[model samples]
Target: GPGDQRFGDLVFRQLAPNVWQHTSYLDMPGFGAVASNGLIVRDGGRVLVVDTAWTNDQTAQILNWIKQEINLPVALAVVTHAHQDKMGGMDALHAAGIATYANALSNQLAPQEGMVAAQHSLTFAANGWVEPATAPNFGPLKVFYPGPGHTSDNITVGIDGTDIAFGGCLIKDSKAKSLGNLGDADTEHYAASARAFGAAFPKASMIVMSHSAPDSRAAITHTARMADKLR
Candidate 1:
């Protein structure tokens, strides 16, 4: 614990060359898996960090690992949705003068939701995340919005040189029999957006999700079979 590189209890695991997931699972305190997840993708050489960690401290551990793993400076940050676990770390990156990318509606709601996150943090253990010391925007990556499946602002990462789509909790490991958490979903709209996601971004070499292992479409279909027993 003395002079250890680990500041907080954040864990970091490299998924691909530049892809990674920071889970907050106690056993894997290398990165705390909060309610949401952050994604990091390397494109054109620079780093694209998606969704800042839950607190400033969370982002610190993540950045520490990112800097250690690659030479690329963080070029951009994409927020998947409005949930605190999803976008709470915005201030840390913004203060560092790093540019950010999120859905258009999320862009409109960021400031307000960010404030709410701040207030909510005060009630619990938080790093007292600060607002940006610099500008928090760069520009939009794609004009198209992924739509309202998981959350109102889920930004699915379109992996470069790969046919993979970062599910952003929109899609889960095929073994996940419980679809997605619909407490925040509009059941009517969820199906529509999911259909659109299928049509718009088809032909993936694999269906990779945040939790569990990657799966095939057939495996995903198997999870659906559980509904038969539910009835």
Candidate 2:
């Protein structure tokens, strides 16, 4: 009884009550179609967005879906890391008057990694940045940073009412046996960071990663093995 609802090429599926998984793809000239993901939290008439698609155009589609289907604009936007897959469409969100927030490290470094510096941002420390801890509430959502694995700024978020963890790229998908890309990763602390992250949220029923569907422990092991192999 599950299905993908489309907004142009951007597709979103209801993963659970009030929690949705949206998929977006980038047309890489030589790489074909590269996919990315983000989370959408809808509670009654309220909505919050986590990460944008890979580009402004795709982000626009996400806005359209929220506007037409939910009839509610995004009250808050949080980027989990500095990668374009998570923050690429932020420009469109800002242009539409949506305030987006990211960990200070992500806000400061992502532009250098290639995102347009989002004017509306939040500092992780100011929001009580800590490993596996909840920050000050942003509307109905809670920001979670389980240390840094994929990138120095990678942060995970927990959907308040749903008990779901959006681990971003810091936690790999169940099928991933090796670390995917390490261009901006904190390789030395990768495994340990993931291990602590998993420990902090043992109650999370569903943990979503940036590129795939998965969660903790074994994920920590996989990261460690990859770290060992790569080193």
Candidate 3:
């Protein structure tokens, strides 16, 4: 059975056999508290983290929990984009001696977003796509660049052997009535990017987004429709 364990303001819940969902919060000035989600994957005595929490403190709490509870060494960390919610804890990860990776564009844009860049660049093909071969440390995860949606450097990750996909902020949750933030969005290509994400993971039963609850593949379609209207 899936259960949640709390570490102060941070929470980790089992989502599958060896997959867990980590949730952290950010206090927005006028919007109140916003929740950010990431993934933790375990294989034997090693683990891989998807994205950092909203801040260094929260991310440190995550590391503490992993050490105290899971007792596994973090082999790698992947930041899906350059947003604060995704890479704000780069320092924490680096301090833990974990190898962090992100797309080259995300690495380049991270500092501009006031976030630390990843230690390594995940290689992408000439066509701007990343496969498991190029991201060997990602284990069963496959990274894809579907043009640009939430952010120009945003990328979605799909777990190869499961029905799970980490859509990051690129794919919205079903309950998302609005697109949320467009401060760094590519409006013209948003719809196309969302559609491309759907095409890539057509059978993804569990789509984990950065905010809100996890949803079905329908979330991707919903996002695409919303982006279309924005265009």
Candidate 4:
């Protein structure tokens, strides 16, 4: 039997007309292994891939689906940040001549820094992992830097009208840090960035974070409130 190209895992639901999320946890046993926290967006006659898969194998499957499903080339790809799971397969995409977007700083470094980030994050098992001819866009999507938070260049993607904002590591599921993640970030600035995001899109009804549930303005308000407390 055949089927449309839909990814599988923890959740498969459309937040809006064209925005979809696919979540999964990676249980690989080696350094080179990784899993994706999937997010894909479809625009008029074009598809936008927010985050790519982790390993070459996973990335291959993703591209295969893209080839079979849409038939149109990926109009845009966004890495959002330097997280390995979101970027490991960049080489695959690069070889295909598919360009990607990410934080502006990343764009400056080109395919080099991306490879650096990948190498640093990947396990030795995946050491020999070959990369695409280029790296994903260093920073195509734009969001306020707020001095510091999550990572050096954390940018979220907002597809206007679709009203979907892919909030990268900036915001995780509420329950996530009921404990808290390592604060390798500028606490005050990080908190401020969250607030700024809340203020940035007052009309935005949907929020697609890197790791969390689709949130409402009020829920995101709660998230902003939580971030404000960190101030």
Best model number under lDDT = 3
Ranking by TM-score: 3, 2, 4, 1
Model 1 C-alpha lDDT per residue in residues 122-160, reported as the tens digit of each score:
010122111232214322222124456566655454455
* Pairs of residues at least 3 apart in sequence or in different chains that clash in candidate 1: 10-30, 10-31, 11-30, 11-31, 23-31, 23-32, 23-33, 24-32, 24-33
Q: Model 2, range 47-142, lDDT digits (tens) per residue?
A: 889899998998999889888877876776878888889888888998898877777777789758898665555555433344233233365566
Better of 1 and 2 by TM-score: 2
Full-model lDDT for every candidate: 0.53, 0.74, 0.87, 0.55
Q: What is the lDDT of residue 6 in candidate 2?
A: 79
Candidate 1 root-mean-square deviation in Å: 9.4
Tens digit of per-residue lDDT, candidate 3, span 1-231: 545787889988788888889999989899999999999888767988999998888999889888887898999998999998999888999998999989888999977898899988876765556945647667777788888889999988888778899889998877689999999999999999998888877888999999878898889888998999987
Candidates ranked by lDDT, best first? 3, 2, 4, 1
Tens-place lDDT per residue, model 4, 1-231, is: 332235643334566566666554567567352324667666666666776665555666666665665566676576756655666667776666666555555444335535323222211112211132233332222333333456555655566666766666676555554314434445666766665666655566777776556766655555555666666
Q: How much does candidate 4 score in TM-score?
A: 0.70
For model 3, the local distance difference test gives 0.87
* Preferred candidate (lDDT higher): 1 or 3: 3
Which residue pairs in model 3 clash with each other? none
In TM-score terms, candidate 2 sits at 0.87
Question: Per-prediction TM-score, please?
Answer: 0.68, 0.87, 0.95, 0.70
